Amino acid sequence: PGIPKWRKTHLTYRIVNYTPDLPKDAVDSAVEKALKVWEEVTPLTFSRLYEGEADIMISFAVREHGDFYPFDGPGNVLAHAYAPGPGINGDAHFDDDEQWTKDTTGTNLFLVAAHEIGHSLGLFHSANTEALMYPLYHSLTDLTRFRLSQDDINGIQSLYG
């Protein structure tokens, strides 16, 4: 019936691409923190690559984009990702037709990334509104006191223990 999980515990990631809505630097922190929420509760580990193909490729795109599932302009879909596997799988795509921000004033790069990395590690959506893996964007997290949800930890720990 197929439950996707990475077969190695050490993964790699590369930020192939940068949104203009942020410094080429805050962007890095965002991704870094989003990988970190998942690494803190699992045996997972992450090395970063600056050239070549990584397990998890992170890119920003608009509209036609380069896979089967084009983005849609501002609003509605903000990002998407693929379950663990070779190729396009593991990758996370962010719709650059949003304004990506450090804080809450726009669309928070950290928040959405954390959810989408969840998909790269093999998590499906949660029916729980408390969870990161809930598919609506939590527009009102203050970030100061953000913690990983219990539904979310159970999920990632059922995969990698």
Binding site: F68, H80, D103, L136
Partner: protein, 175 residues
Amino acid sequence: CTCVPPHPQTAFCNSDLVIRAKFVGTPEVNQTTGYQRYEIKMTKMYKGFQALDIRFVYTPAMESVCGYFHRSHNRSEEFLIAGKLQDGLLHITTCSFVAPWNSLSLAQRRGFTKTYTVGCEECTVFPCPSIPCKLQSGTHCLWTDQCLQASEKGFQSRHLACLPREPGLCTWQSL
């Protein structure tokens, strides 16, 4: 997949088709394209008389990549679908406005039926994430429901349309 599902009025104005339909079968996966399709019987249509009745809705084959998975087992429950027309096929995502007709408010059904189309040409429902929000134009109505499920459960979403009071000016009004 990460969504900001739209205000109903936005959903009306920006969708190519707006219909009531029943979901009749299991989706078929079609791995050549990457999309799965549901067969549907349309019961009513509100927007989209510039086409061809439609028998199918398409959506991404994976949840991860914004595929709509239909939870209800229905088979007689009418749903409102608001979707775009790609190459002559009705398309939705999990971000689309899809909801059981009965579960809508009165103000939402009035509006899908008549009221909303008044606001399409001249007015815009702009989503306000964090307050403060910038109001970019006088024909923008700020959508300030900060319910998590603002689209399904919010006051403005469930009761108000963004309509012109005069040229250059739109405000939230009650249906």
